[PDB]
Every structure is written in C-alpha cells, then in structure tokens.
C-alpha cells in the first residue's frame, strides 16, 4: 500500500565505464545514453546489482534499466535507482 | 525500430495548478508530488492532453502520468513529456 508509484524503464548504451564506490555496501554508478537528440541518465545500483554492474558492465554496452526516478535535492539531481539491469546485446 | 527505450510511469498528487502556455499549440505543465521524502516531477502535456490537463486538472488531485523522461540540457532539466494523464481519485 501507499497510493503513489514511480517506475522508470530505459534501454540505452553505457557511455562510460561504471564507478564502483563502496558505502558503509557496494554502489556502482553509470550513465546511459538513451537517444530519442539524446537523454543522459545517471544510473545507481546497490548490493549484488552494484557488484554485477561493476564486474560485468562496460562502455558502449546496451542495457535495460528498470528502477525509480529519484529527484534528489538541495539542488535537484536526477538519478535512476535501478532494481534491474540486463544486457540487451 | 530504434534500439532504445524511455518510459516513465508516475502516480502522484498535483502540488499546484496547471499552467496553460500556448506555443506556435497548447502546452500545459504541472508538477506532481510522488512520495516514496518526496520526488517532484515537472509534467509537460501537448495538444488535446494539454487541453484536457488545464481544463480538468487542479492541485491536490491524484494522477497517473505515463510518458518519457526528458533530460533536457545547456544545464540539464528533467521533465516528463506525458503521453497519458488519468485521474486516480
């Protein structure tokens, strides 16, 4: 329950290699190019998905990303907290 | 065809009344509160949907928004170009 919903699904290329970035643990970020001019999206992954991201994802590679569109303030910064990342190619 | 994909689906309240804003024609914008802290999203509508938006949408009202997440630069500004807006309440 809640009464709200936030879902984003993107398919794009990785335009550069993922950054592994362990918190407190594992966080991997990468930005994908989702062309329509292009839209660029910062993707964030956590835990095993962060782990999967860093040890398998590389630039150019085409991925599906499923997650939430975070509008994080305070100066509003848009990131996708991914719950799913699959290779497409 | 293309090889890319960009889909966003949000359900949130309108936190203020829509702005009708005719181009060249009809464009209506509004921002929804999609709480998880909240994420705020600028929604853009065009044509009959802009028309529908302005003449039917008001603050507080809970809507589904389906569309695309635009990352428009150049200083990157996130808007949802909606293809669908339904009342939920």
Describe the protein in words:
- Two copies of one chain form a homodimer.
- The first copy, chain A, contains one helix and six strands.
- Chain A has 89 residues and is mainly β.
- Chain A has one domain: Nucleic acid-binding proteins (OB fold (Dihydrolipoamide Acetyltransferase, E2P)), CATH 2.40.50.140.
- The termini of chain A are far apart.
- At the A-B interface, β1, β4 and β5 of A face β1, β4 and β5 of B.
- The PDB classes it as dna binding protein.
- Keywords: TM0604, single stranded DNA-binding protein, Structural Genomics, Joint Center for Structural Genomics, jcsg, Protein Structure Initiative, PSI, DNA binding protein.
Defining traits:
homodimer, OB fold (Dihydrolipoamide Acetyltransferase, E2P), enzyme activator activity (chains A, B), nucleic acid binding (chains A, B), 89 residues, Single-stranded DNA-binding protein (chains A, B), globular, 6 strands
């Amino acid at each position: 329950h809640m009464s709200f919903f936030n879902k984003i699904i993107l398919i794009g290329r990785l335009v550069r290699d993922p950054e592994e970035r362990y918190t407190l643990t594992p966080v991997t970020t990468f930005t994908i190019a989702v062309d329509r001019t292009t839209d660029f999206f910062r993707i964030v992954t956590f835990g095993r998905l962060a782990e999967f991201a860093r040890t398998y994802l590389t630039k150019g590679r085409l991925v599906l990303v499923e997650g939430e569109m975070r509008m994080r303030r305070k100066r509003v910064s848009p990131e996708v907290v991914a719950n799913v990342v699959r290779f497409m190619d």
